[PDB]
Amino acid sequence: IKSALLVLEDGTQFHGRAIGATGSAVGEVVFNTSMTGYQEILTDPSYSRQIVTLTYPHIGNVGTNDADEESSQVHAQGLVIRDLPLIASNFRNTEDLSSYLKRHNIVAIADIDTRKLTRLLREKGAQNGCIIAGDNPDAALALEKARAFPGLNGMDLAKEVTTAEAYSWTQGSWTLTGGLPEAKKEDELPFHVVAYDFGAKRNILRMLVDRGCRLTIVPAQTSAEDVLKMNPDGIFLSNGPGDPAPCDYAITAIQKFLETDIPVFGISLGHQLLALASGAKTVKMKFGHHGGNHPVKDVEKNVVMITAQNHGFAVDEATLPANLRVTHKSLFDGTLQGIHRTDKPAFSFQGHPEASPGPHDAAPLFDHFIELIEQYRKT
Amino acid sequence: IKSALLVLEDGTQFHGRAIGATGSAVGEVVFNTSMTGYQEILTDPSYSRQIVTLTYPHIGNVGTNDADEESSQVHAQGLVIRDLPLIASNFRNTEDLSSYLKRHNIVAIADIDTRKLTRLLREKGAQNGCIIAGDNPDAALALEKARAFPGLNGMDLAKEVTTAEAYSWTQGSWTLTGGLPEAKKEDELPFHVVAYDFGAKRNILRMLVDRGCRLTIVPAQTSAEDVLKMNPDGIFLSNGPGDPAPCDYAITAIQKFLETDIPVFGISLGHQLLALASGAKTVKMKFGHHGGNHPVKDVEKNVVMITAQNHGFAVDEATLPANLRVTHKSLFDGTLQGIHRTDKPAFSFQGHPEASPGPHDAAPLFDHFIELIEQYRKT
Amino acid sequence: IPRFNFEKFAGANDRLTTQMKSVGEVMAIGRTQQESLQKALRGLEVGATGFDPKVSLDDPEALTKIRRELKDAGADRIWYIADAFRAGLSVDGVFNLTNIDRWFLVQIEELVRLEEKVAEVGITGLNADFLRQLKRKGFADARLAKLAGVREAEIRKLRDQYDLHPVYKRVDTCAAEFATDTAYMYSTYEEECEANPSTDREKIMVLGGGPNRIGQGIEFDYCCVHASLALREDGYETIMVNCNPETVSTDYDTSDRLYFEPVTLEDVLEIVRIEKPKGVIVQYGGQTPLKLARALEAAGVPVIGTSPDAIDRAEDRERFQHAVERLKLKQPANATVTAIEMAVEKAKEIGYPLVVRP
Amino acid sequence: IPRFNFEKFAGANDRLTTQMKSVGEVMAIGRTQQESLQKALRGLEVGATGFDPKVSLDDPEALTKIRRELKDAGADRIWYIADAFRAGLSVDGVFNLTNIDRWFLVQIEELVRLEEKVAEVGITGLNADFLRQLKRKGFADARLAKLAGVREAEIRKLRDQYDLHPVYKRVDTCAAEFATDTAYMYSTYEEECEANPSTDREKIMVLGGGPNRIGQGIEFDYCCVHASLALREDGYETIMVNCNPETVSTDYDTSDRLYFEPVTLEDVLEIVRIEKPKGVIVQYGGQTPLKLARALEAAGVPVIGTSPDAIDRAEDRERFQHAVERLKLKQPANATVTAIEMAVEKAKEIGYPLVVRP
Numbered sequence A, B: 001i002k003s004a005l006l007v008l009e010d011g012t013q014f015h016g017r018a019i020g021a022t023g024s025a026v027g028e029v030v031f032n033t034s035m036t037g038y039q040e041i042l043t044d045p046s047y048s049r050q051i052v053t054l055t056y057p058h059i060g061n062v063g064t065n066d067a068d069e070e071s072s073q074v075h076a077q078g079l080v081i082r083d084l085p086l087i088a089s090n091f092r093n094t095e096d097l098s099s100y101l102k103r104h105n106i107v108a109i110a111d112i113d114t115r116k117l118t119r120l121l122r123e124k125g126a127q128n129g130c131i132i133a134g135d136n137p138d139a140a141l142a143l144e145k146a147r148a149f150p151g152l153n154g155m156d157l158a159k160e161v162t163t164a165e166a167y168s169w170t171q172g173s174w175t176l177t178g179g180l181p182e183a184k185k186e187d188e189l190p191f192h193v194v195a196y197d198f199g200a201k202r203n204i205l206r207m208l209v210d211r212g213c214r215l216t217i218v219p220a221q222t223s224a225e226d227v228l229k230m231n232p233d234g235i236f237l238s239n240g241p242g243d244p245a246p247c248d249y250a251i252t253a254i255q256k257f258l259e260t261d262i263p264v265f266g267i268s269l270g271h272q273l274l275a276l277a278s279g280a281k282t283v284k285m286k287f288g289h290h291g292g293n294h295p296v297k298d299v300e301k302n303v304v305m306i307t308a309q310n311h312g313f314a315v316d317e318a319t320l321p322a323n324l325r326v327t328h329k330s331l332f333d334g335t336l337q338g339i340h341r342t343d344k345p346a347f348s349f350q351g352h353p354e355a356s357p358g359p360h361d362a363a364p365l366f367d368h369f370i371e372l373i374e375q376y377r378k379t
Numbered sequence C, D: 001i002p003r004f005n006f007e008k009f010a011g012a013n014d015r016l017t018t019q020m021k022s023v024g025e026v027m028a029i030g031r032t033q034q035e036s037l038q039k040a041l042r043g044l045e046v047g048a049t050g051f052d053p054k055v056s057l058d059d060p061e062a063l064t065k066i067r068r069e070l071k072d073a074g075a076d077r078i079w080y081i082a083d084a085f086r087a088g089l090s091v092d093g094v095f096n097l098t099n100i101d102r103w104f105l106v107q108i109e110e111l112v113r114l115e116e117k118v119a120e121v122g123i124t125g126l127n128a129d130f131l132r133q134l135k136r137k138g139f140a141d142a143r144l145a146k147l148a149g150v151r152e153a154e155i156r157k158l159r160d161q162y163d164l165h166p167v168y169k170r171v172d173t174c175a176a177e178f179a180t181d182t183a184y185m186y187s188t189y190e191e192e193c194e195a196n197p198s199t200d201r202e203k204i205m206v207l208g209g210g211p212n213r214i215g216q217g218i219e220f221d222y223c224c225v226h227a228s229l230a231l232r233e234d235g236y237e238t239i240m241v242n243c244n245p246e247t248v249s250t251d252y253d254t255s256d257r258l259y260f261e262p263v264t265l266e267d268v269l270e271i272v273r274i275e276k277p278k279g280v281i282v283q284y285g286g287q288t289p290l291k292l293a294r295a296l297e298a299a300g301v302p303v304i305g306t307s308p309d310a311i312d313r314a315e316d317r318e319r320f321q322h323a324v325e326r327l328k329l330k331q332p333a334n335a336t337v338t339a340i341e342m343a344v345e346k347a348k349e350i351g352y353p354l355v356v357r358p
Ligand SMILES: NC(=O)CC[C@H](N)C(=O)O
Pocket: A046, A238, A239, A240, A241, A242, A243, A244, A267, A268, A269, A270, A310, A311, A312, A313, A314
């Protein structure tokens, strides 16, 4: 028998089985409703310091593989599931879930009532928690660790996951037939985009490459001055963990960009960051949006899109500057989902146009960003 | 495909498959003829800094279990085998050999011409060597590490494996029925024996208790004086790694003990120490004695025993002081195997009376020690 | 799981192909696949309590039949799959013959192995921990009963002793991301219960007929729906119990509370246990609920309408012949033969033509 | 491996028990169990090249037969086991049936799996890396051939190409801990060769008959020894090639050099390759070596004594009658019939009684 235990800040206990590394894990606890894409989810840097509970009972049905990694490592702090399948069954698999977790040194627990946990988080709101996996899991210790967690509000995590030094990205999207492409050649990409790495997902980069952008991935703290020096065709603000709020450096730099005519586009954290620099305020949601079936209306066109969501903070629509027009809203809760600067070539989306995992409905968000870029090169 | 490679000093290579931990291992390469007892061998402290090559092709047929552990960890530097069996098929098995190796972080290779290696070692003599298990083992590097190795000659290993502090041992031997018995209450054991841990094998301790001895395991460098304070019923000198010659502390101590009337008994390393202490000299064997089919003759009785052997150095019969009588001799090569002090209740054996693994044929040597103690106490 | 009726079509090709031959279907929900599958099996209305064997272990010819049943699927294949694992067939072996994803196969085999342990330890080895694990895998009391070699009520007794009962989760289209006001539930062995029965009203429970079969169709369902709609309109809190996905009865709008469960004694007692209804109707879903009436009544269920016994009176050839007699009514000549020659004689008595009812 | 003769005892009970019924036995030496096991199978003299199949894959009744053979062992059980794996039975299942330790069974299963690969990839897929893997497992040329749909020679040539040849290790009683002056060797696919053939003496090779069976006893072995004793005495370097553990022929004292190997074309050729004898005697070991003579000579083996053809002359029913004719000798009236009715006519010719040879 391999025990494991999960304890919430409020004292709630969940007893299960250890399916990953031996040890302890602490972080904010969340639930994601994605029936597929667990690997992608686990490898999302945005999940840094969060303990991920999956609502879909059977997690690991397809094992894992490299192409399904959205970053170089597993960023989730811990994984909480209802059931770990006996086997992985998919031509794409290269290593079973449990093995993968152990490899990445992830504390994970299975066999617990994830529905009870979900309903609790929904009703009471997010909560920090601690998973302990080992011979005899100390429930009082776990509760200690959880209660001591500083929490995500006001925590800059973007500076934690970002890249140390700048680098290039010219690799495109995966294909069933060919797999993951060989990185393009610089001369094979018309546009040059500078992307701020706030803990950026690979799919965003790949997709941008798919649309003809050669990329320069820059550390979160990179000054606007340094960027501007590279003569960007466009500036992109990646997704990532924590509160956008405390990221002074980014906001500052962005404001700078906003003085210029360089097109700016941001996704999730980048949306937030954009809104902040534009003088809007960001709030911490009760429980957030974590899943792949979230309806978002494009208010302009009056069309709905099924989207992939992964965020705990939002832009207050009621503090939006007049220079910030609303472009999309959640059909689930009415929360702000998109904005466009009425006076600048800058826009952002709260959701994940790049999906991975999730529906491709929002990818056209990218196209607009290309538009701007094309136009900008016109001038 | 998990490569592994073994290179020797002479630059002789062995391409294999990795069955243990990833990484590299370096030391003296030896060969052992035991067809059973792999686990016990591996966990033999006497093997510290030594790479173990087993002659019997199929190693791991019976998996592993705790009760077959001769010490707390695997002391052998690395493991070289012909074949690692698909499975372990033993009711006593608790963990497959590969897993076990990995667990203990041991670099080990299989699928090599273990016979060719054996003949080499037998013909040319021991050789230092290096194993490299990894994605693309570097021959050159392995040869470098191999040649770089300092060499066991003159190397005190006893001080590296001995216990930090002193302790009490009151546990006896295993039984098919009973398994490993609970540790005996101190008031239960008739005699008190003080044993110097030069990297002492558990079985020796167990077999002593089995004979009514309570034990005090003492750090190698322990002083004679400290010892004599405990008022020992008898003193025991264990087996252990490296050269016995550099062991100045012990020799001196033993000499002290040798002025006394306390009965003294040493095994293997302990036997070499006892001989140095008495005035003789040791020598490093060409390849030594590593197997469990070694015939030794009790020259006094003129009887033969099949004995367990693990030793690369030896007591030169030619330098024996006169206070040192020859008790046993190897039937294989004619080498010294046992001695008795003509003037003191002091004797030692070059082979392993405690076996594990191997023939119980030499067990009665213990009996004699007892006899000395029983008689001592008579006084 | 589809429901078939081959037995009714003697001369028919009973192999499954691209042309549908099923006459109905059952559905089940569980927190796990094993649980989900097992529940479906015991709610199939074929006499199955889960993975009941089809071939004996000591039949030398077993593997041959098993092989045939796997290679060329009939309605019994699901059961032959477990028998295959029982007989020493590997998952790969079974895969090559059936082409059913290993992901599912490995799960069935696990059930078998567990079944093997139960068989081995007997009812004595059925500690609270092990029995809970079993229930979580969807094992029916009836199935455990058989392996342990005891009556089903014994397994159920045990659960009451360990306080081993299921909880009810609700369907909500959104993995609990939003709250619901509907009461569409299923049982499972988990921690939190979402039933939250009312103490408020007088409840009426209506038992459906499970999957439809020939002779047990929609007609019965229709009757079941009407009961619900009527009593609900009259002011009762209506509870519907059924697991036929095709029907209006399993439409959350048809009743105040819907339990999409196997219509078995085990499943129904658990719901009654917490609902504590005022009355239960067993007379409208056909054979399925009718066959439960007696056990239900005896387990202490407030069955309403025509009593179990009365029904029995009528269904039992004997009790009936006796009533008819008593009323002085006309009934065709009849006999109850045991042997051949006995019937020849009796036949002589009764007269040809004859109607021979097994 | 024991050698049996049940086909000579039609009425006999061919199942294995506590009373011996084997007539002989063969032995093999391998650096691994797999190698050792397969070598023995191929030296058994029963027409096997290793784990040749007993029942067909498309046979509906196949799992039944296999099961029987596994539960109540016969002399063919070893073959039925591999067949069990092919047919999808699991190690555990086989074990439950045979009680043979899994340690052994798993190795056979491996072999069956590799076998499968071969089959699939054909000769094309027989790269040097793989072929060498297969060789180290004990696979015989003839076995791989069958799998890949080629002549045994094709595999052999293939090996010659990759310069894929076994090495010979010696027996010394002490796991190489000590040097030997004895020349007792076995083939394996390893690195270092211990053969060290002399360039010195004229060498004469004697091929034994393998395991004894009825009709091929010690009598032939007696001969073989005598050949060795004699020629050695005469000053030739004598080389025995036999794998019968019971005989004097496999006593290291009987010859200068002893190769304890399967008396097969493959194995022999390999020894001749490095030995390059002056001559090879195949007329003393009985049917085993005899049947090899033709192929050996063709492969360029220096077959001494009565030529293989000459031999054939005698053995061939037709080649012989001719010679008899030629010598104007008396032979019983014979006829070669194809059909029944043919016989009856031809029989009337010859005359009863008759001796019907297949
Ligand atoms: N998904 C992201 O890129 C960031 C979301 C942001 N960190 C939040 O939790 O609201």
